[PDB]
Design an enzyme around this catalytic site. Structure first.
Site, PDB file in Angstrom:
ATOM      1  N   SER A  48      -5.980  -0.954   1.958  1.00 53.83           N
ATOM      2  CA  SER A  48      -5.749  -2.394   1.831  1.00 53.83           C
ATOM      3  C   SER A  48      -5.857  -3.235   3.129  1.00 53.83           C
ATOM      4  CB  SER A  48      -4.385  -2.636   1.171  1.00 53.83           C
ATOM      5  OG  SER A  48      -4.408  -2.260  -0.192  1.00 53.83           O
ATOM      6  N   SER A  95      -2.110  -7.681  -2.020  1.00 54.47           N
ATOM      7  CA  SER A  95      -3.096  -6.605  -1.967  1.00 54.47           C
ATOM      8  C   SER A  95      -3.811  -6.443  -3.301  1.00 54.47           C
ATOM      9  CB  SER A  95      -2.467  -5.250  -1.572  1.00 54.47           C
ATOM     10  OG  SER A  95      -1.846  -5.290  -0.293  1.00 54.47           O
TER      11      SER A  95
HETATM   12  C1  LIG Z   1      -3.781  -1.004  -0.423  1.00 54.12           C
HETATM   13  O1  LIG Z   1      -3.439  -0.067   0.587  1.00 54.12           O
HETATM   14  C2  LIG Z   1      -3.242  -0.682  -1.807  1.00 54.12           C
HETATM   15  C3  LIG Z   1      -2.155  -1.682  -2.180  1.00 54.12           C
HETATM   16  N1  LIG Z   1      -1.234  -1.832  -1.049  1.00 54.12           N
HETATM   17  C4  LIG Z   1      -0.014  -1.830  -1.394  1.00 54.12           C
HETATM   18  C5  LIG Z   1       1.054  -1.691  -0.402  1.00 54.12           C
HETATM   19  O2  LIG Z   1       0.747  -1.721   0.813  1.00 54.12           O
HETATM   20  O3  LIG Z   1       2.230  -1.523  -0.799  1.00 54.12           O
HETATM   21  C6  LIG Z   1       0.151  -1.904  -2.872  1.00 54.12           C
HETATM   22  S1  LIG Z   1       0.206  -3.594  -3.398  1.00 54.12           S
HETATM   23  C7  LIG Z   1       1.095  -3.695  -4.932  1.00 54.12           C
HETATM   24  C8  LIG Z   1       2.008  -2.492  -4.929  1.00 54.12           C
HETATM   25  N2  LIG Z   1       3.290  -3.014  -4.551  1.00 54.12           N
HETATM   26  C9  LIG Z   1       3.357  -4.447  -4.380  1.00 54.12           C
HETATM   27  C10 LIG Z   1       3.373  -4.884  -2.936  1.00 54.12           C
HETATM   28  O4  LIG Z   1       2.633  -5.804  -2.636  1.00 54.12           O
HETATM   29  N3  LIG Z   1       4.159  -4.293  -2.008  1.00 54.12           N
HETATM   30  C11 LIG Z   1       5.097  -3.193  -2.220  1.00 54.12           C
HETATM   31  C12 LIG Z   1       4.147  -4.741  -0.626  1.00 54.12           C
HETATM   32  C13 LIG Z   1       2.050  -4.889  -5.025  1.00 54.12           C
HETATM   33  C14 LIG Z   1      -1.170  -1.260  -3.275  1.00 54.12           C
HETATM   34  C15 LIG Z   1      -1.044   0.249  -3.366  1.00 54.12           C
HETATM   35  C16 LIG Z   1      -4.424  -0.847  -2.758  1.00 54.12           C
HETATM   36  C17 LIG Z   1      -5.632  -0.049  -2.288  1.00 54.12           C
HETATM   37  O5  LIG Z   1      -4.088  -0.427  -4.081  1.00 54.12           O
END
Ligand SMILES: *C(=O)[C@@H]([C@@H]1NC(C(=O)O)=C(S[C@H]2CN[C@@H](C(=O)N(C)C)C2)[C@@H]1C)[C@@H](C)O
Length: 242
Positions: A48, A95
């Site tokens: 991401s 993301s």
């Molecule tokens: C990117 O690395 C992945 C993306 N990134 C990411 C994270 O860094 O936690 C989640 S975003 C989505 C899951 N949790 C929520 C959030 O924004 N946070 C916990 C900060 C929304 C996801 C795995 C992408 C490649 O899928």
């Protein structure tokens, strides 16, 4: 000096049972902290965090703009938080992969490979798959390389238009406490070898001073995503950066 600081930060990482590094760049000076210093120059998928460069490229080449609304046509996504219309800026904060994939497709593989190579991001290899090169390989980047990239962004030193850089910077504001602005981008690569967690960005101090950081750590599915934030803030505070 740093050894007292690093002893404390090493411990932060030990206390939460992971291997991680925190790279700090003030201007041209780079220091390493954490309990896994060799991670600092080991290549990992950017996951991401590549959305920062994706946005820069897409905006620079006029494939979108900060006002455009990317509509959710209704298909189920990997996170319910992503299931809504959004701007490029809102997709950065969340993301939201599908939005950035649509952007990457607009850019095309060949413009993408060209731009990645012009900028020299990581190993600068994207292969032939336009929508997962930054998630499953071949694209790879060190944490040191990440901190240098974001430091340049913060100083408007990347080879893109000034206004494009300002626009992507504005999408990256995470936190604003006691006059200190914290900009950054998380990443969590959940489906690869050892899972990889990122949190890469900078602190704008009240007098305007910029201190850039790149946290990179091994993730496990039992961890809250906020462990990356926790380790960052604790370390920055301990370093008197915040
Ligand atoms: C990117 O690395 C992945 C993306 N990134 C990411 C994270 O860094 O936690 C989640 S975003 C989505 C899951 N949790 C929520 C959030 O924004 N946070 C916990 C900060 C929304 C996801 C795995 C992408 C490649 O899928």
């Amino acid at each position: 000096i740093v050894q007292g600081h690093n002893q404390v930060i090493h411990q932060y990482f030990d206390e939460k049972n992971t291997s991680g590094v925190l790279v700090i760049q003030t201007d041209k000076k780079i220091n390493l902290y954490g309990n896994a210093l060799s991670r600092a120059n080991t290549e990992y998928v950017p996951a991401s965090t590549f959305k920062m460069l994706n946005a820069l490229i897409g905006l620079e080449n006029q494939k979108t703009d900060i006002n455009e609304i990317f509509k959710w046509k209704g298909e189920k996504r990997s996170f319910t938080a992503w299931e809504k219309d959004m701007t490029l800026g809102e997709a950065m904060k969340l993301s939201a992969v599908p939005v950035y994939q649509e952007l990457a497709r607009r850019i095309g593989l060949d413009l993408m490979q060209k731009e990645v190579k012009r900028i020299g991001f990581g190993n600068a290899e994207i292969g032939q798959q336009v929508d997962n090169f930054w998630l499953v390989g071949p694209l790879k980047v060190t944490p040191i390389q990440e901190v240098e990239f974001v430091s340049q962004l913060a100083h408007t030193q990347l080879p893109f238009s000034e206004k494009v850089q300002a626009n992507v910077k504005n999408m990256l504001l995470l936190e604003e406490s006691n006059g200190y602005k914290i900009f950054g981008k998380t990443g969590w690569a959940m489906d690869i070898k050892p899972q990889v967690g990122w949190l890469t960005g900078w602190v704008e101090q009240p007098d305007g001073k910029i201190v850039a950081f790149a946290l990179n750590m091994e993730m496990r599915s039992e961890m809250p995503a906020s462990i990356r934030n926790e380790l960052l803030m604790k370390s920055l505070k301990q370093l008197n950066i915040i």
